[PDB]
Amino acid sequence: SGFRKMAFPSGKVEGCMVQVTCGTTTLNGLWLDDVVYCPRHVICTSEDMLNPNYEDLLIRKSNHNFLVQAGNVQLRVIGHSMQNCVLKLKVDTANPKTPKYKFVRIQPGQTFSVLACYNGSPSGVYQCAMRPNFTIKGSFLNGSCGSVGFNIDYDCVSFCYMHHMELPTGVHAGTDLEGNFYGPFVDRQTAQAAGTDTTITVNVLAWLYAAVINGDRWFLNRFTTTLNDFNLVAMKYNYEPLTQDHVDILGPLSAQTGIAVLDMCASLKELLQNGMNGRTILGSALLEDEFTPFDVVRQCSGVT
C-alpha cells in the first residue's frame, strides 16, 4: 500500500545524455544511434535571444563549431541540420547504449518522467504532466536546456519532451523530439504567457480511485450524478470536460473498486463545492491531477 509520485527508472536515458557546446553556450544533447538532438538556441549568444533569425545564424556554423562530449570523450560531428526548433548533429559513432526507442508527441493530461540534466550530466528525476495549457510544472535552471521527458513501455523508451524555456509563472515549455513546441510558444525571449491552468479531471478521478484502493475513502458520499450535470460543476472550478472516452479509460479502476465513474464524479463534485475541510487524501491537502489512470494501475499492480 501507499501511493507516491513515481518516475520511471532513468538508466536507459542516462546512457543517451551528452554535453553539446558551441561558442560559449553549453547545453544537453540526446545521443541516439549516430545522431545528437539538442535545442537550436545552442547557436545563439546572449545578444541574439531578443529576436534571432535561426536560419541566418546557422549559415555561420560549421560541423567543427559543435563540440559533442560523452563523459570525457569527444564525438566527431560530421553533419548538422535544423528540424523545427531542434538541431540534429550527425556524429561518426553510434551510441553503444542506444535503447529501443521511438519519438511520440503526447497529448495534454498525459504524464512522463523528466531527467533534469546540466552539462550533459544528470541532476535528478521527477514526474510531470503535460498541462492542458501545454506547459509543465517542472524544476529547471539555466543549463537545463535539452533535458528530456520520457515514458518506458517494458524495454522501449518513448521520448516525448525536450526542455527549452521557462514562462513568467515559473512553469516550463519545450518541444517534442521533432522540434515542434507543445503549445503556442516560440524559442525567443519575448512577451509570452501561459493560458488558464485547468485541472485534468480524469486524472483527479484516477487518483480518487487510488485513494479508495489504499483504504482512504472518507470522501465517498451517498450521491450519484450525470455526466452533463457533473460537467456543469466542472466548468465552474476550471476542470476539463469529462468525456465518455475518459469514463471508458477509468473502467479498469471502476471495476476493481466496484464504484461507478458517475458515483465517483458525485464525490468529486462535493469536494469541489465544500473543499476538504482540513482533511487529506493520500497525504495531500489538495486534489492531485498528475496521475493518469494508467499511472494508478501500474503503481497499484506493480508493473515493471
Ligand X SMILES: *C(=N)[C@H](C[C@@H]1CCNC1=O)NC(=O)[C@@H]1[C@@H]2[C@H](CN1C(=O)[C@@H](NC(=O)C(F)(F)Cl)C(C)(C)C)[C@@H]1C=C[C@H]2C1
For ligand X, the closer CB: 44 or 75? 44
Closest distance to ligand X from the beta carbon of 178 (Å): 18
For ligand X, the closer CB: 51 or 304? 51
Is 140 one of the binding residues for ligand X (CB under 6 A)? Answer: yes
Interface region with ligand X, contact rule CB under 6 A, candidates 56-64, 100-108, 158-166, 220-228: 158-166
Say whether 85 is catalytic: no
Closest distance to ligand X from the beta carbon of 116 (Å): 10
Residue of 173, 149, 137, 172 whose CA lies nearest to 290:
137
Is 133 one of the binding residues for ligand X (CB under 6 A)? Answer: no
Is 164 one of the binding residues for ligand X (CB under 6 A)? Answer: yes
* Radius of gyration, alpha carbons of the chain: 22
Is 49 one of the binding residues for ligand X (CB under 6 A)? Answer: yes
Specify which residues 167 forms β-bridges with.
171
Closest distance to ligand X from the beta carbon of 166 (Å): 4
β-bridge pairing 101-103 and 156-167: parallel
**Residue choice 58, 67, 104, 167 for contact with ligand X (CB under 6 A):** 167
Is 50 one of the binding residues for ligand X (CB under 6 A)? Answer: no
Is 192 one of the binding residues for ligand X (CB under 6 A)? Answer: yes
For ligand X, the closer CB: 114 or 249? 114
Closest distance to ligand X from the beta carbon of 40 (Å): 9
Cβ neighbours of 224 (radius 10 Å): 15
Is 188 one of the binding residues for ligand X (CB under 6 A)? Answer: yes
The DSSP code sequence of 1-63 is ------PPP-HHHHTTEEEEEETTEEEEEEEETTEEEEEGGGS--TTGGGS--HHHHHHT--G
Q: Which of residues 66-95 bind ligand X (CB under 6 A)?
A: none
Cβ neighbours of 182 (radius 10 Å): 23
The Cα–Cα gap between 269 and 292 comes to 19
Say whether 64 is catalytic: no
- Give me the catalytic one of 44, 117, 128, 145: 145
For ligand X, the closer CB: 122 or 252? 122
Q: Which residues bind ligand X (CB under 6 A)?
A: 27, 41, 49, 140-145, 164-168, 172, 187-189, 192
